[PDB]
Design a protein around this ligand. Structure first.
Ligand SMILES: C[C@H](O)C[C@](C)(O)CO
Ligand SMILES: C[C@H](O)C[C@](C)(O)CO
Ligand SMILES: C[C@H](O)C[C@](C)(O)CO
Ligand SMILES: C[C@H](O)C[C@](C)(O)CO
Ligand SMILES: [Mg+2]
Ligand SMILES: [Mg+2]
Ligand SMILES: [Mg+2]
Ligand SMILES: [Mg+2]
Ligand SMILES: [Mn+2]
Ligand SMILES: [Mn+2]
Ligand SMILES: [Mn+2]
Ligand SMILES: [Mn+2]
Lengths: 387, 387, 386, 386
């Protein structure tokens, strides 16, 4: 079964199911979708809401009159279907003015325009009920070493995020920001390329509590990193404000496959961690239905995102509730991992002969970890051989 | 010429030139070196000092009597040659007791022993004059998802670093810690896999000012990331306490080539940034002379590390001092990148019609960045076609 | 129940369950195993046989008398258990003499010794019944550009494989060779780094029919490549002589995880292709039980390799037999892919206005491929969610 | 001064300096260039010639009258400047009809159209004097495992290349084909992903001598492979028909940086190998001036490609001519690598006690290779630091 409903909090970008299929080497294979169509179709499939870039909802350069009608129609569709808009973002990467960045463009006039375009869309985002405002600095970075002084560009990035935090708190809005890391593409190398670099950058903003991360499965996998481990560090920091779900087959161009495709075992341990941690934000998909597909295949792929989340939710829950797994976690000492190392304190540790002078290093080294039996019980659960 | 002298602050790990050549698939190809030999040979080549793991200087399991003689001989060599010991570290990865980690081992008795082994070596490090104490958590991580709860392991890592900061401040030592990230190898995935993840982890320690990073060229390149950009963010954070220099050819096993080998253009922009920022710490090489070499080739490779740093220092300096490069940096707007975006403040930006309502996005987009001519002047300087 | 039996032809290298857990950053975590114990324990788990490098079965530098004892004990355990030895290989990578290669070492004396050590073990391999003799040139390659002139090295490599073909045919043996590609590690770059470059090199040997490939999951994945695609080109060339199963998580050091770990979807498409094509060789695991494990963990990981192959075999067979999948395969034109483009010939195609002058490119471009529905049926089958 | 002249045989694709800067995340940043302007500007920089896909020179869907005008203007600019057209290719990847491939599309009608569109441009390529016709199967492959049965697809791919060989021989043309490998992008996995798998596939064509490879720096590097090693195996097979020069920084999207950017040491070892082996084909750049640039930046990046090749040519020739390097090459036994292992034959090697029974493995293992000194001489030559 695995039938989604709005309570599962699945959301999708308008640009996701609306991707026309223009790639590096090829023209569009589908016509543009009206956002009304996307909202209604996604609600029929069991989604909870949608998200948008400014330019997905209001064509760039629209008159105020055109802007009003575009927003009216979108809000009309949301109201007719019950869909929500939990997150919004700004396109600071499609227009050629952003070819060397928005907030870190070397041209100061471009950096000022990037912030004005962002602030205008924050007002709309709050009007539509969004709780999170994402920034993906896809054009911040370089192809060559002389072109961007990174410490200057970090100073300009912090300037822009601190001005946006001044604007949201000056207006009394509750919305918070989430930076979405990516390590490369479309620039040779992008600034804040991973969850760890964005977590560290936030600690240098004037009010760090206003900013978190929106990690994307494929973008951490573009650097060969373990996405569940990155999401564990973002949870430990208290900064998982939103998350973007898709698939990726290793280290290559950003594929944005539907969720569950790409690294299926990493998607299992991701859903295991989100549900064990009680993550209560949107389960947001940032995926591209491949350009081989027509519109029926667009909707099939969006459906598959949700389906695979629900299947993996079932299996991770069954693994953690299985008493033989809980016995194997004890044999692997996962319960000792969760106990403090030295709640007795420093002096007690220094005085504890069991910790050094009388520690039998050979007996401790002979103890197996029993990790392989634990992981085969995990595999059995993912494949439904256990329940 | 490019002849190093002690004032260039080049240092080497005892384990570097002392690597016997045992790899995943092969036996040692060289005999072990006595540390005395390594100190004297490196001083003949122009080094400033050496660094050590506890177990490189004192064989594991040594009696106190053996320990005293090993340290006496080492200090004797340092005193005879003028070499210094700026950094030390603990081996928490070779002995089988550390097969599931030191500070984050699931066995709590192992975590306590890891801290006792570390503290004993901090005392020796300070006796020998070290200013930085590095921790490379090579065994912290996992090969499978059930084996390590990452938020529990981060809690145990923070516990251990905060106990070590209690010990150093309780003893009145000036030494500071530097975490050396690596994304994988020998574990499937290692915790704090990049400079950004370690920078973010330090902000959650009780006294973040006691801890920085020791980034290694090849380990950021193992994740496909831009090492100069990572070092720029560590400088911007005020956390470049030490740095490890080597070469790596892309995304593969840790090669530890001599510095300048692997990605030569990244080593040029690395030395450009270290010298432009005024980095005043050790230029430390963590490299393995390939196992094809005999001892003559060990010393040739160590010499090459220093030589290549000095050549690239020359070329980066010449690039930045060349007036045609300085004119090209202006044509590329590197000087506008260094000016605040909106020192006038938020309200002035919102009221500035030149930033949105009257911004000519098409004229700004038509302006070329002139990056390719700048980067070809950089290439000409690296290859000595310009001066 | 997914219980393996010898009929499933699962085999293991002595070096896999016998890995003592020494890595470049750490000492052994397990004692060495007697090959007789490995043979008995693997037979109890359902395996079909074992494979070996010469130096796994006979310690390097053994006397002839010691050699005969080691072999006699091993053959007695094979006989007692019914286990077979389908494949053998030479260790041309542990001993420091091979630090710059065996067959491509720059020292000519070392190239000659590498061939002598291999021919000695081919004799033993045939005495133990092996059908395939693998070569893994893990020390063939370089860390630096001037160290190895690759055209010269490939001449040397072809000379070595041609001599070995001369030896096996001179002796009347039926054994055939299989080259196992790896892109890097332990050398910076290894020669013949993928199944493609090994297949291309075999076509330049004097008798290409004596040589195939032994592709390993993890090694193609270390170059980011699609392992099922490379095994499809090996099968298409008629060169899949043997296969080496394990798991790897992307582009990094060679992990040698148990089969089914690492890229689980690629493991499912590999088993689908092996059973659809009727591959009849050994299903050989080249894996390392992680060094975190004790001996009970070693046998659990070995059991896991076989269990995972049998689960994935069930799931791929259910996918291909499901009528709704067969309908989706037609909807995606997988049956048109299998029809010749132009059996009518060149002139007929040139004269066919339907292929150019009157071809409606827009109508054909509007046709969806329906690959996502197909793939979600495959995911539902893999996860038992139909 | 490193000033290129037409004698250096540097060529550029019309699509390289003419790239308008549209990427998957962004709109064009430059206007389209008239191919006549490109030919005149490249000749002013010292280039030898240009190359083209059919749809670069003639807009897709042009009338015969428009086609003849586009070609006539182009030929007049070639004539005025002295520029040549050594190579041409077909675009079987932009138009949405090719979304699942050209020669391996699951739709048979699309496979037939792909061959018609290619044969039409082979005619034009020969009229413009091309010697090599490249195929880049950038849409041949898949995102998912059930979408493409790779054995079937390779049968289709062989059928297409055999028909094209039939056409060129039927017409008496001297033009030869070169397959350009790429591992991924725009498809999840592309068939024939490296020089190895393209060389292996050509051996299964009906007349392998008509086909070689056109390896591209960046594409092998997208699989982490050593580009000079792959070009050495292409030369060893006698199949380096053409080469495509650019730069790439590791395993990521295809960057197509100017030549000399990306992996500069591998660029030096590539130029060393091309000039040592006497490669005599075009030195063709397949690069994109980054979209940050205006038209002056486009011509600076094109000039840079040629400048970098000429600097690296100087440096590699100085390395190989330096007596101290030649001495270091001997110290590392590069001259023994070039001597046959066993010209004496199999029986002589079996009877040679120096190769086994009396070989002193420890003495030989103690011999350093001296590769680091060698490599530091190469670095000092590359950087002009001797
Ligand atoms: C929100 C962000 O802009 C969405 C993109 C474009 O898909 C980047 O992942
Ligand atoms: C200091 C650290 O332990 C040194 C290693 C082992 O080379 C890791 O890079
Ligand atoms: C047969 C080959 O030697 C086995 C290894 C050592 O595992 C490499 O794959
Ligand atoms: C000839 C080939 O089509 C050129 C491309 C498009 O740049 C791919 O490398
Ligand atoms: Mg995203
Ligand atoms: Mg290091
Ligand atoms: Mg193997
Ligand atoms: Mg190309
Ligand atoms: Mn993405
Ligand atoms: Mn390293
Ligand atoms: Mn392997
Ligand atoms: Mn390319």
């Amino acid at each position: 079964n695995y039938q989604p409903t709005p309570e599962d909090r699945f959301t999708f970008g308008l640009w996701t199911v609306g991707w026309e299929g223009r790639d590096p080497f090829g023209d569009a294979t589908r016509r543009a979708l009206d956002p009304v169509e996307s909202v209604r179709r996604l609600a029929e499939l069991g989604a909870h809401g949608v998200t948008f870039h400014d330019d997905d909802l209001i064509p760039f350069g629209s008159s105020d009159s055109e802007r009003e009608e575009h927003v009216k129609r979108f809000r009309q569709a949301l109201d007719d279907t019950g869909m929500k808009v939990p997150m919004a973002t700004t396109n600071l990467f499609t227009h050629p003015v952003f070819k060397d960045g928005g907030f870190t463009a070397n041209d100061r006039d471009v950096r000022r325009y990037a912030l004005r375009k962002t602030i205008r869309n924050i007002d709309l985002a709050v009007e539509l009920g969004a709780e999170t405002y994402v920034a993906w600095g896809g054009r911040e970075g370089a192809e060559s070493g002389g072109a961007k002084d990174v410490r200057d560009a970090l100073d300009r990035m912090k300037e822009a995020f601190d001005l946006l935090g001044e604007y949201v708190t000056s207006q009394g809005y509750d919305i918070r920001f989430a930076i979405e890391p990516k390590p490369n593409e479309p620039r040779g190398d992008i600034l804040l390329p991973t969850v760890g670099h964005a977590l560290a950058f936030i600690e240098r903003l004037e009010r760090p509590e206003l900013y978190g991360v929106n990690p994307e499965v494929g973008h951490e996998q573009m650097a060969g990193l373990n996405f569940p481990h990155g999401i564990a560090q973002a949870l430990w920091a208290g900064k998982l404000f939103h998350i973007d779900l898709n698939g990726q087959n290793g280290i290559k161009y950003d594929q944005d496959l539907r969720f569950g495709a790409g690294d299926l075992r990493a998607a299992f341990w991701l859903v295991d961690l989100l549900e064990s941690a009680g993550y209560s934000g949107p389960r947001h998909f940032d995926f591209k239905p491949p350009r081989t597909e027509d519109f029926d295949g667009v909707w099939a792929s969006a459906a598959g995102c949700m389906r695979n989340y629900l299947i993996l939710k079932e299996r991770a829950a069954a693994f953690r509730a299985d008493p033989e797994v809980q016995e194997a976690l004890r044999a692997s000492r996962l319960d000792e991992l969760a106990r403090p190392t030295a709640a007795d304190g420093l002096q007690a540790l220094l005085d504890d002969r069991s910790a050094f002078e009388e520690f039998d290093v050979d007996a401790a080294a002979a103890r197996g970890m029993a990790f392989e039996r634990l992981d085969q019980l995990a595999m059995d659960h993912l494949l439904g051989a256990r329940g």
